[PDB]
């Protein structure tokens, strides 16, 4: 996360690295997702709108999962073995995030709904707990 002894850190630098290794370079990708009449002017305006839209699309999902302002955020949703039966070592040491995305693509929407429901339940439970004071 702070790159002690890293050869070099750059946008998508750890794209071919394993998920475990690429998980220590999230800051590198995260900080480049927002910064980087004539025909060109319209194209630039469309590009800016697209960038804002794409950034906010992920930011909203992070917000409604309770992971706002976090790069690695643990959740209360247990991992259903049906989504992927590979061992933890088989995922974080012998696989890359690009390969992983191709495996859990079919189950992404199911996971997202579970995360949203879990966050809502956590918020309600916290409200109830605080109401006892």
């Amino acid at each position: 996360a702070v790159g002690i002894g890293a050869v070099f850190l750059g946008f998508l630098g750890a794209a071919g690295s394993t998920m475990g290794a690429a998980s220590m370079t999230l800051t590198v990708q995260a900080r480049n997702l927002l910064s980087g009449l004539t025909v060109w002017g319209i194209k630039q305006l469309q590009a800016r709108v697209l960038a804002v839209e794409r950034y906010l699309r992920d930011q909203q999902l992070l917000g409604i999962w309770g992971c706002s302002g976090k790069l690695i955020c643990c959740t209360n949703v247990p991992w259903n073995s049906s989504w992927s039966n590979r061992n933890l070592s088989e995922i974080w040491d012998n696989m890359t995030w690009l390969q992983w995305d191709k495996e859990i693509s079919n189950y992404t929407q199911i996971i997202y709904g579970l995360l949203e429901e879990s966050q809502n339940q956590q918020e309600k439970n916290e409200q109830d707990l605080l109401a006892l004071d």
Binding site: I4, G5, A6, A14, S17, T18, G20, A21
Partner: peptide, 11 residues
Amino acid sequence: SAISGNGDSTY
């Protein structure tokens, strides 16, 4: 070739 500090990444 190059290798990171902890040896996880090699180039």
